[PDB]
Every structure is written in structure tokens, then in C-alpha cells.
Amino acid sequence: YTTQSLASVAYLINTLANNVLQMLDIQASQLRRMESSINHISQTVDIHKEKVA
Amino acid sequence: LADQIFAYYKVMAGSLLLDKRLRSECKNQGATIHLPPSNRYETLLKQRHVQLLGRSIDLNRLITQRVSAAMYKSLELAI
Amino acid sequence: GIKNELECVTNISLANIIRQLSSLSKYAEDIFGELFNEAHSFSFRVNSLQERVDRLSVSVTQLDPKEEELSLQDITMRKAFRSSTIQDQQLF
Amino acid sequence: REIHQDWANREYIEIITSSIKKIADFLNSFDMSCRSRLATLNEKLTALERRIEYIEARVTKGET
Amino acid sequence: LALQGLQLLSQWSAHVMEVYSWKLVHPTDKYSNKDCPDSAEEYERATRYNYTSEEKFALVEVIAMIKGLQVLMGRMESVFNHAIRHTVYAALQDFSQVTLREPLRQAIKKKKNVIQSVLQAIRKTVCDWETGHEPFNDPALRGEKDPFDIKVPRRAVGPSSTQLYMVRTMLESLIAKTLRSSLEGPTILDIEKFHRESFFYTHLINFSETLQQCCDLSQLWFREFF
Amino acid sequence: VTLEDALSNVDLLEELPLARYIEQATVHSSMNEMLEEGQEY
Ligand SMILES: [Cl-]
Ligand SMILES: [Cl-]
């Protein structure tokens, strides 16, 4: 029961950790794409304000 | 900490842009504009998880809150 | 004391090891839950930002330089933009 | 005899306890690593939220 | 290294606490510190006014050196736990199985039953023979000298606390007509050697708890007595 | 080689010819428990 318990705990932790890392990796790349998208909007607003000027 | 960090980096900026010839001329006239002492604030600025009483404290985030307010206050004063 | 049976100590101390794995399972769950709750909280903000970023793209494409008039009422009748000034204190 | 079996029993015990400590170590250093990552994500996200507020205000009228 | 680092941490912690401890019983006054009023209450004179700028910096240094090394020692726990267990086992088995042969031979070769009984009890308590059984074909166990080699096993597990207590106490009784005068020169030094070195075994086996006890600065805040 | 080491070698010449531990450990262990109780007080 000891061996079985050690193996089980290690497994469930390994699985949940891997999932958490995957979640953080996805959220990072989300912000990376969003910054790129915000930057292009900002450039577009800059261009527009200059045209009015 | 945030107060002295902002004051430190403002003095650094002011020193960096101060005309070098004027600096030496003042030194010869016996009125040296005293160069600020260097400090070691970076490790504190890199702290994202200070473990205190079971809490995880983002020191970087907290400093930024104040430093950003100080930047805005500087700009308001200039205008 | 010291008079206990060897095999009896072995079994009791192995049973306590399984208890340690029980508490370690609870300790692990708490750790993963605290991290999940923060990242989950970020998800709501990320989704809410992504939609704001997308409907701004639309609003920005529809800007017309030839059309846009400049109003002096933006100075006298409407407030100046202020960015968030919220600061965290009393963290304990 | 029973002492020789005791030595084997306690070696086994030593191996399991060592492995439990390794799990605990991993759990602590995983927590710390994710704390950094969540702080970094919050930093970038907060900035991106602020920037959007700003850009929006450049295109929108103020409150009367 | 494990023992050296624990001793160093202990030295540093003792330094901080001893300075602090001294200051608490010798609060300053106006005569020794010009900035300290006679109106200042004892505790403030014991703490706040009782340290110069240089003393306060030096204290934070040592505190930082303690806590910093505590982190590095803690990160090395798993390696230390294994190496300590291997070393303690090896020292105990080498001593019991091999080193105690000569004094045991001399205990049976002469009529020294009391010394024989304790030396055997020690061997009985801890010896982890590789075959599983004690070697009975041993010349020293009989009384005569060697033409004899024993391969001692290597395990990464220390003795139990009862095993260590019994061995140490039984070895102690030999070196304490006393049982000491009935033993040879080099052998007495051999028991003393192992008895002295085994003093720290419990501490080192319980490394984690010992680490914390060597770095304990928790008492600087408490002030119930004052 | 110290003087007491030389004197001890001479002492050797004048010398030539021509269990309960479990109980004590139980007493010791019992007394230790009192220490822990005293700490609590
Ligand atoms: Cl704590
Ligand atoms: Cl002892």
C-alpha cells in the first residue's frame, strides 16, 4: 500500500502540474498576440491624429 | 522604498544630462556639483514573490504603483 | 520507550508515511488551487480585454480624418482623461 | 535474524521518505516558479488594460 | 560539509542572539549615549538606543549570511541526507564488525567475561552482516590471531535512536578495578575515537530539524518579560 | 612524544603479571517526558 500510494501521489501531482504549465503557456501567448494587436491599433490612432493635424 | 527609488532615478537622469563642461567649470571655481552616490535597488525591483506571513507579495508591482504616480506628479508640476 | 517490537515500529512508521502522503495530497491540492484561482481570475480579464481590443479595431477603422471636427467644448465641458490611480495597501 | 530484517525494513523506509521529500521539494519550487509567472502575466495584462483605456479615451468624448 | 555548515550557522546565530541578549540586560543611558534621554523607558534603552548605526548594519549582515546559507544548506538536504546515512552506517558497521574484533579476541583469550558480554551485546544490537549471520569461523571470535578479511556492506540508512543510544552507552561504560584498566592502549583510543565522533550522528541524521535550530532568530521580536 | 606519554610507558611495566541498559534507558526516557511537560508550563 505504501508503494502504491507513493506512485499514485507522484502521478496525480505530475499530471496537474503539467496542466498548470500548459495553462500558463497559453495565457502568455494570448498576451503576446494581444499586445501585437493593441500596438497596431495604437499606430492606427497615431496615424489618424496626424492626418487631422 | 518607492520614494527613494524614484528620487534616485530622477537625480541620475538630472546628472546624466547635465553639461560636462559646466560641471568641470564649477569644479575649478570651487563649487563642485556633487555627483550622486550609486545604489543597489535592482534586486528589490526584481522581487515578484516576497514570502511573508504566508503571503506572496509582488514587490515590483507595488513599487511601480507609486513610481508611476511620481512620474505623473513630476509631469504635472513641469506643465 | 525502547521496548517496542521492531516489526511493529516498521509497520506503524510505514502507516505514518501513508499519512504523510495523505497530507501531501491535501497540501498539493491547496497549492494548485491558489495558482488556478489567480490564473482563472486573469482569464476573465483576458477575455474581457480581448473583446474590448476587438471592438476598438472596428471603431478605429471607421475613423475619418476628412470628417472629424475639433471641439473646444472638450476642454471646458468635459473632464480630462485620468488613468487608474489605485494602490494596494494593508496587505496583511 | 530479526535485526537483519530490521536493517532491510529501515532502508526501505529511508527510500520512501527520501522520495516524499523529493515530491515536497518539487511542489515548493513549482509554486515559486508559477508565482513568478503569474506576476509577469499580471504585469503585462495590467499594462495592456491601461493602454486600452488610454487609446479608447483618445477616440472617445469625455463626461459632462 | 553538512556538519561544518551547521556549526558555522550556529556560531553566527549565537553571535547575534548573544549581542542582543547582552544589550537587554545592559540598557544604555545619557552617559553612554548622548542621544538617549533619562526619561526613555527601559525597553527602548535596551533595544532602540542600544545600537549605533554600525552595529545595526553588522547585525543585518550576519542575519542575511545566516538566512542565505540556510537556503543553500536546505537545497542540499537530499544529497546530505543520503551521504550522512551512508557515512554513519559505514562507520558503525566497520567499527562493530571489524574494529571490535581485536578487543573481543583479547576478551576471550583472557578470562574477561564482563567485557566480552558487553562487546558481544553491542555487536548483537547493530551488526548487519552481509551473509545474514555472524561469521562463526572467525579466529578472533575463538581466541587466536589472523593469517582474515570481512567485506562490510554499504547501506544508506543510519541506526535507530535506540540502537545508537545502546551502543554509545555500552561503549561509554567500557571507557569510564574498572573495565577501562582491563583493556589495551590502541583499543581504548579506538572506542574514544568512535564515541567522540558518534556524538553528532543524531543531529546529522535529523538534518532538517537541526538546520532550523542552528538558524533560530525568532526571539528578537518577543517581549513579554519587559 | 610527551612526558606523560613516557611516564605511561613506565606505568605499563609496573602493571605486568608475573542487560540493565534497557531499564536505565526507560528511566531516562521517562525523565525526558517531564522536561517536555515543564516546557509547556
Ligand atoms: Cl510563516
Ligand atoms: Cl547516548
Please check whether residue D3 touches C, CB under 8 A.
yes
E10: helix, coil or strand? helix
CB under 8 Å to E145, separation ≥6 — which residues? Answer: E105, E139
Residue B52 CA: which ligand is closest? 1
Element (H, E) at B51: strand B50-52
CA–CA gap between residue A11 and residue D23 (Å, rounded):
11
- Tell me how many degrees the CA angle C83-C89-C91 measures, rounded to the nearest 5: 135
CATH number of domain containing C37: 1.20.5.340
**Touching E: which chains, 3+ CB pairs < 8 A?**
C, D, F
Ligand 2 centre to CA of E164 (Å) is: 7
Strand partners, B50: B57
Q: In the structure grid, which three cell numbers stand for residue C51, read together?
A: 473583446
Mutate: best of C35, C45, C55, C61, partner A, most A CBs <10 A: C35
Pick from B48, B63, B50, B76: nearest CA to B7: B63
* Domain range for C28: 1-65
**E143: phi > 0 → left, psi -120 to 50 → alpha, else beta; which?**
left
Q: Tell me the shortest Cα–Cα distance from F10 to chain E, in angstroms.
A: 13
Pick from E68, C61, C22, B42: nearest CA to A44: C61
CA–CA gap between residue E171 and residue E217 (Å, rounded):
37
CB under 8 Å to A38, separation ≥6 — which residues? Answer: C53, D48, D51, D52, D55
How many CB atoms are closer than 10 A to CB C88? Answer: 10
Contacts 24+ apart (CB under 8 A), E213-221: E214/E6, E214/E9, E214/E10, E214/E13, E215/E9, E215/E13, E215/E66, E215/E67, E215/E70, E216/E13, E217/E13, E217/E16, E217/E17, E217/E63, E217/E66, E219/E17, E220/E17, E220/E20
Q: In the structure grid, which three cell numbers stand for residue B55, read together?
A: 503571503
Pick from E80, E92, E132, C11: nearest CA to D13: C11
CA–CA gap between residue F26 and residue C2 (Å, rounded):
7
Ligand 2 centre to CA of B54 (Å) is: 39
How many CB atoms are closer than 10 A to CB E127? Answer: 17
Residue B54 CA: which ligand is closest? 1
Q: Span D1-59: which CATH code?
A: 1.20.5.110
Pick from E170, E5, E12: nearest CA to E100: E170
- Tell me how many degrees the CA angle E143-E147-E148 measures, rounded to the nearest 5: 75
Pick from A41, A37, A18: nearest CA to A29: A37
- Work out whether strand B50-52 and strand B55-57 pair parallel, antiparallel, or are unpaired: antiparallel
**Touching F: which chains, 3+ CB pairs < 8 A?**
C, E
Contact D64 C81 (CB under 8 A): no
> Residue E112 in contact with residue E182, Cβ under 8 Å?
yes
Residue E169 CA: which ligand is closest? 2
Q: Tell me the shortest Cα–Cα distance from C88 to chain B, in angstroms.
A: 7
Where do the H-state alpha helices sit in D1-64?
Answer: 2-59
Chain A meets chain B (3+ C-beta pairs below 8 A): no
**CB < 8 Å from E in window 1-40 of F:** 12, 19, 21, 24-25
Q: What residues of chain B lie within 8 A of the CB of C83, using their CB?
A: 72
> Residue C49 in contact with residue D48, Cβ under 8 Å?
yes
Q: Tell me the shortest Cα–Cα distance from E40 to chain F, in angstroms.
A: 33
Ligand 1 centre to CA of B28 (Å) is: 57
CA–CA gap between residue C72 and residue F40 (Å, rounded):
77
Q: What residues of chain F lie within 8 A of the CB of E170, using their CB?
A: 21
Q: Which residue of C has its CA nearest to A2?
A: C18
> Residue E46 in contact with residue E226, Cβ under 8 Å?
yes
This structure was determined by X-ray
Chain E meets chain F (3+ C-beta pairs below 8 A): yes
Ligand 2 centre to CA of E198 (Å) is: 9
CA–CA gap between residue A14 and residue E168 (Å, rounded):
44
Contact E170 F21 (CB under 8 A): yes
> Residue E94 in contact with residue E198, Cβ under 8 Å?
no
Residue A7 CA neighbour count, 13 Å, CB half: 4
Please check whether residue F41 touches E, CB under 8 A.
no
CA–CA gap between residue E168 and residue E190 (Å, rounded):
13
Please check whether residue E131 touches D, CB under 8 A.
no
